[PDB]
């Protein structure tokens, strides 16, 4: 009983002491003579329109030409970014949707929402129409994020404080990761697709191994719920998007905080976070209807992406790193370059 | 300058846009109420006369009502309560009958305080359904309201107790400049609740139209 709690306290203090001992210097002081990137001027290129309600999520295709968006209108429009054309317009069953996923192969799409059911739609059929290929069920809470591992697997994170790994064919729940104490609000997949980090509402993030079940590392330091998580292209770091006007950068191989990106002029929460192709920049979406481009190596502002009349809800960067698409509650997506 | 396949793709995109516009205009001509309550309350009966979210479509006097009942959604209300911003009205069902500690009325007013004084719901109106009148009568004749409301000081008649409860439930609204609360007692008389809902929705629609034109 109590002895277990005391042993847990000793384990925690040992962990924090070891982490403190492993700390010798800060990244900010390490990169003190690394020239600034200068002002980053951003201009809208395309202004994809056609939604009739708040946009809640989006995802870029593998070719970095096609994207998919969802809104409370009840639609899953698929846009061709180059010519602002619509390829498909999938009508949903329940309009309370807050998640999208585009398969890396490009054949399927996935959509979650408040109905606790993850629908998987097939795009390429001989009938020339999109039909619901599968309907995964089993979560007892609202779905928050879903990502495609392969054409036959999916990873979901919902509000029942658990994450799931589903096999599409059998429709089962092949793995279930648990250990959080609050709603899980975001999820990101490593480039090698063997590990993934989930950020919960208990002001924490965890690193899960897809093959196994337990969480190898737990990262804390935020003072509020985390609404966004994004990996670093190197695969040895990630960035969070918590609600207390602060985005922090965590490193996998030291279990330690590295840097925080905060300004006394910013008080609103962060909804989306995404790195760049190389990792020099970090784009974050705030509730000020703006988007901030933080110099990820030295924690300085490098530009502003104003132009939206409402909260920025989804943010994405193309695979080739040629453009950045932001979708807001104004029922508008914009393609900056 | 476009090719043939590009022209055909543009044609398909225009057709898709037309279909989207028609679907949106069709879906804008309807009323969307959000149902709420605490405990058992009277949600079952309320949806009777009229695994996550549950919808219910019904037509009255040539008007389409949808009634989103969050119900079985045990989660953080703060995370998804903003999805319902813009609903026409919030129906709030409470039962006067319980008032027996084991305190439920206290929880009901706590939930009402948390819902009414919310940043998102600063414009949407609230319809209040105080139900279980017969059980309230059967209970009042042996026990007074002093157990739940000590401060209370009045006659044990039914009318005074009902008025006091209504006044306290209407006293928790702080922004009494943009939002109005309508109160009913259902009584399960057959066409007594849907008519009240229709009247409240008509008043809300009138106010919204006046605000949109620019003279309200």
């Amino acid at each position, epitope marked *: 009983l109590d002895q277990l709690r005391q042993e847990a306290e000793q384990l925690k203090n040992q962990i924090r002491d070891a982490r403190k001992a492993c700390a010798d210097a800060t990244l900010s002081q390490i990169t003190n003579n690394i020239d600034p990137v200068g002002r980053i001027q951003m201009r809208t290129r395309r202004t994809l329109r056609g939604h009739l309600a708040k946009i809640y999520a989006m995802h870029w295709g593998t070719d970095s030409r096609l994207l998919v968006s969802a809104s409370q209108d009840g639609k899953l429009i698929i846009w061709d970014s180059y010519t602002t054309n619509k390829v498909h317009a999938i009508p949903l069953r329940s309009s309370w949707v807050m998640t999208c996923a585009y398969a890396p192969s490009g054949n399927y799409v996935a959509c979650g929402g408040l109905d606790n059911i993850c629908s998987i739609y097939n795009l390429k059929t001989r009938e*020339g129409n999109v039909r619901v290929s599968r309907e995964l069920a089993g979560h007892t809470g609202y779905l928050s994020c879903c990502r495609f591992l392969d054409d036959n697997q999916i990873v979901t994170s919902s509000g029942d404080t658990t994450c799931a790994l589903w096999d599409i064919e059998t429709g089962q729940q092949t793995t279930t990761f648990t250990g959080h104490t609050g709603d899980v609000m975001s999820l990101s997949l490593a480039p090698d697709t063997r590990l993934f980090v989930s950020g919960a509402c208990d002001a924490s993030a965890k690193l899960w191994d897809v093959r196994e079940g337990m969480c190898r590392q737990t990262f804390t330091g935020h003072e509020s719920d985390i609404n966004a998580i994004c990996f670093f292209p190197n695969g040895n770091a990630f960035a969070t998007g918590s609600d207390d006007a602060t985005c922090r950068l965590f490193d996998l191989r030291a279990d330690q905080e590295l840097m925080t990106y905060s300004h006394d002029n910013i008080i609103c929460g962060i909804t989306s976070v995404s790195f760049s192709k190389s990792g020099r920049l970090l784009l974050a979406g705030y509730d000020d209807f703006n988007c901030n481009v933080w110099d990820a190596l030295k924690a300085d502002r490098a530009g502003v992406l104003a132009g939206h009349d409402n909260r920025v809800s989804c943010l994405g960067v193309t695979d080739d790193g040629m453009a950045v698409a932001t979708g807001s509650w104004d029922s508008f997506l914009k393609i900056w370059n | *300058t476009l090719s043939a396949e590009d022209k*055909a*793709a543009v*044609e*398909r995109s225009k*057709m898709i846009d037309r279909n989207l516009r028609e679907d949106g205009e069709k879906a804008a001509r309807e009323v969307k109420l959000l149902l709420l309550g605490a405990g058992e309350s009277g949600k079952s009966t309320i949806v009777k006369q009229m695994t996550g979210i549950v919808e219910t479509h019904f037509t009255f006097k040539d008007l389409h009502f949808k009634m989103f009942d969050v119900g079985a959604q045990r989660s953080e209300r703060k995370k998804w309560i903003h999805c319902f911003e813009g609903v026409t009205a919030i129906i709030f069902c409470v039962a006067l009958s319980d008032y027996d500690l084991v305190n439920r009325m206290h929880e009901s007013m706590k939930l009402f305080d948390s819902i009414c004084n919310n940043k998102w719901f600063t414009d949407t109106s609230i319809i209040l359904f105080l139900n279980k009148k017969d059980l309230f009568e059967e209970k009042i004749k042996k026990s007074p309201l002093t157990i739940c409301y000590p401060e209370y000081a009045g006659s044990n008649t039914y009318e005074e107790a009902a008025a006091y409860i209504q006044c306290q439930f209407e006293d928790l609204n702080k922004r009494k400049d943009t939002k109005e609360i309508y109160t009913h007692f259902t009584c399960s008389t057959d066409t007594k609740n849907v008519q009240f809902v229709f009247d409240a929705v008509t008043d809300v629609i009138i106010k919204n139209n006046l605000k949109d034109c620019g003279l309200f």
Partner: single-chain antibody
Amino acid sequence: DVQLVESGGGLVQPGGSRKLSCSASGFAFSSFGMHWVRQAPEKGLEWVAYISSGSGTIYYADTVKGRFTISRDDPKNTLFLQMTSLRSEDTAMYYCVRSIYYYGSSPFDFWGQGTTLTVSSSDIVMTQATSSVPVTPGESVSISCRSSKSLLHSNGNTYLYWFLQRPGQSPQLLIYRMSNLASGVPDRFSGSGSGTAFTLTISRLEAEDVGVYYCMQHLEYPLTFGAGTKLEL
């Protein structure tokens, strides 16, 4: 179960006004463009008419303006072409081709069965040069379709298609846009080249590949077809 069945064939006197019909079952007919393509008794294919989805774009061939009228009926899932003032040239077998146009789509996917019609009494020329060549199973072959104008639009994609017609059956799509293998086609087939120089290659030959191979352009809409190269033995 994708089926396109045509009807309305039979002998017609000169000056007749017979009408042909096409019934489609097994796909969303409302969102597919439809092509009527004729084939002479022994010559190659020849585009005739095209109707778009939504009936917003109608295109006719060179010889049939004012005499042929195409039309579709979506709820009944039918597509009929009314032919007036018939001559002796129109003695041919008519087909029924579907084509859906969007980014990454494969037009001219499925072909009908064809109905015969007998009547007893500018454009991009695409020469296929060679007409026939004897081959043996287990060999690699190539077919050239030298064109007149370069089929290289500013978008960066070449509009050219390779079809194969087996002896007695209906032509089926093999290659679209000279680089993408059509669905269901085995890996062995391939296509390559540049503007005004296109080659389709087959790695190993065996039965069921003997037939006639055709090439078609799709830049503008007097859609032309190649002469047709015969592979036999």
